[PDB]
């Protein structure tokens, strides 16, 4: 009797969406690894060039020291390979080579 109340059937639902069937992606033609571009030497040629150059020609660095032929050295005298007592005046074109490292500026 007095248990009457607002009437509102109470149920839960989990209805599914209909299959949307969206648009379809298409395959975009591309350069694979099998297409040689990435495996060709060429692709590495830039990388090869920006590598620092070696400037070391020899173990002696291009200034080979031999006494052979040097007039008296095998006998007593190193005259031939000895600096004069009196340093010569500096040549204008050697002046720039003689500048101390400090004088050079910043690398």
């Amino acid at each position: 009797m007095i248990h009457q109340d607002y009437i509102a059937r109470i149920r839960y639902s989990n209805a599914l969406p209909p299959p949307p069937i969206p648009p379809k992606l298409l395959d975009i033609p591309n350069t694979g690894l099998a297409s040689g571009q990435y495996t060709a030497p060429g692709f590495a040629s830039r990388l090869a060039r920006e590598q620092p150059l070696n400037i070391e020609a020899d173990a002696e660095l291009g200034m080979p020291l031999d006494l052979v032929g040097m007039p008296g050295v095998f006998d007593g005298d190193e005259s031939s390979i000895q600096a004069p007592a009196q340093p010569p005046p500096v040549h204008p074109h050697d002046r720039p080579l003689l500048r101390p490292l400090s004088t050079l500026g910043k690398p």
Binding site: L16, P17, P19, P20, I21, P22, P23, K24, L25, L26, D27
Partner: protein
Amino acid sequence: TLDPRLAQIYSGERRMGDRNTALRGIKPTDFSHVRKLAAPFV
């Protein structure tokens, strides 16, 4: 039951949603913790 021509036409197609992916909704989320609580259910 694909015609050969259809089969190759479909070959070029790549799906981006189907029956199942639809149920993931507008932004996917993990519901494996719900798996955890379905478990004690049975």
